[PDB]
Structure 1
Amino acid sequence: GVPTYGAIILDETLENVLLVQGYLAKSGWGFPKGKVNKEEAPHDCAAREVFEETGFDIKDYICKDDYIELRINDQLARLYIIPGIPKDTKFNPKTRREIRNIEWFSIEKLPCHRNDMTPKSKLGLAPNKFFMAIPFIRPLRDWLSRRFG
């Protein structure tokens, strides 16, 4: 799959993270990210996708070694970690045709797994609007503990 790049933006308290909500297949909440273009560097793709989805330019804040990368179904997603962005920042996507809404969420309240259906003796996982964000949550919490503590 084509690699994706984007950001985990945190506020100044390190409490909250910025998520975006798309439409249709992308209808839940997730970190801002998207597919790398031909010959485009990872940092440039992250900034481009993040500015397209949120209107905030991370270019001056990216740190090369500060990211979480996950491979999910043989597609690689790398989110650069961007702390210290004020919660009163005005975020506005490029077009509302791709992004419904943009919100801060408390890290400690976000799930780091979906719930099973063991109450119903049924296999699988219950729907969860944070599905796309969930895989990054435990790694982010561990990364923040190691880097700030």
Structure 2
Amino acid sequence: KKSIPVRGAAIFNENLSKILLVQGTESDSWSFPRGKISKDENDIDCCIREVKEEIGFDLTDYIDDNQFIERNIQGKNYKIFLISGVSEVFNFKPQVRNEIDKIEWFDFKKISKTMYKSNIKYYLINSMMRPLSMWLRHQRQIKNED
């Protein structure tokens, strides 16, 4: 069933109140970057290499140790490692094959209203909204002083 493994990276604003989407090779599309990951490598270490190479920035102490989510959409395997704690002082830009490079910061509010779709929307995150939200909700709790 699973012959080709795929993994993506989901980054949230410093206030963990908004989602950062990017434009891929597709035209009117909006989602996190993904692709094949190296085998025989620690999922975490693999993240840094795919994160620092894709986003351009590396997360040393701003990356979760054992926090990730799994979800299969349309029979397609889609894995995403939760990584929050980044700052807004640094600018993150996409760095992939020569094509289109555009950044768009969409508020989770809009994503939560995906139902309000009228034309073309990214249902990809809609399916992962459950885990993404629930899990991300946990990180917000720790934000507390205790």
Provide the C-alpha distance between the structure 2 equivalents of 1:131 and 1:59, rounded to a whole number of angstroms: 31
Structure 1 pair 95–83 and aligned structure 2 pair: CA distance change class (3 A): closer
Taking the TM superposition and a 5 Å limit, the aligned residue runs for 1:66-81 are 66-81=67-82
C-alpha contact 1:50 1:57 (8 A) present in aligned 2: yes
C-alpha contact 2:7 2:37 (8 A) present in aligned 1: yes
More strand by share: 1
- TM-score by length of structure 2 reads 0.73
Match among 88, 111, 128 for residue 136 of structure 1: 128
Provide the C-alpha distance between the structure 1 equivalents of 2:60 and 2:102, rounded to a whole number of angstroms: 22
- 1:11 is matched with 13
Question: Unpaired segments of 5 or more residues in structure 1?
Answer: 118-125
Provide the C-alpha distance between the structure 2 equivalents of 1:29 and 1:12, rounded to a whole number of angstroms: 20
- Pair 1:92-2:93 in alignment: yes
Structure 1 pair 99–4 and aligned structure 2 pair: CA distance change class (3 A): farther
Q: CA deviation at 1:45?
A: 3.0
Provide the C-alpha distance between the structure 1 equivalents of 2:54 and 2:105, rounded to a whole number of angstroms: 14
Deviation string 1:65-92 (CA, Å, 9 cap, x unpaired) is: 2112112244432222122212232113
2:5 aligned partner, one-letter code: P
Q: Structure 1 vs Structure 2: percent identity of aligned residues? A: 37
Taking the TM superposition and a 5 Å limit, the aligned residue runs for 1:1-149 are 1=2, 2-24=4-26, 28-95=29-96, 97-111=98-112, 127-128=120-121, 130-149=122-141
Of 9-18 and 94-103, the range deviating more from structure 2: 94-103
Q: CA deviation at 1:106?
A: 1.0
C-alpha contact 1:53 1:99 (8 A) present in aligned 2: no
C-alpha contact 2:72 2:78 (8 A) present in aligned 1: yes
CA RMSD in angstroms comes to 2.8
Q: CA deviation at 1:43?
A: 2.0
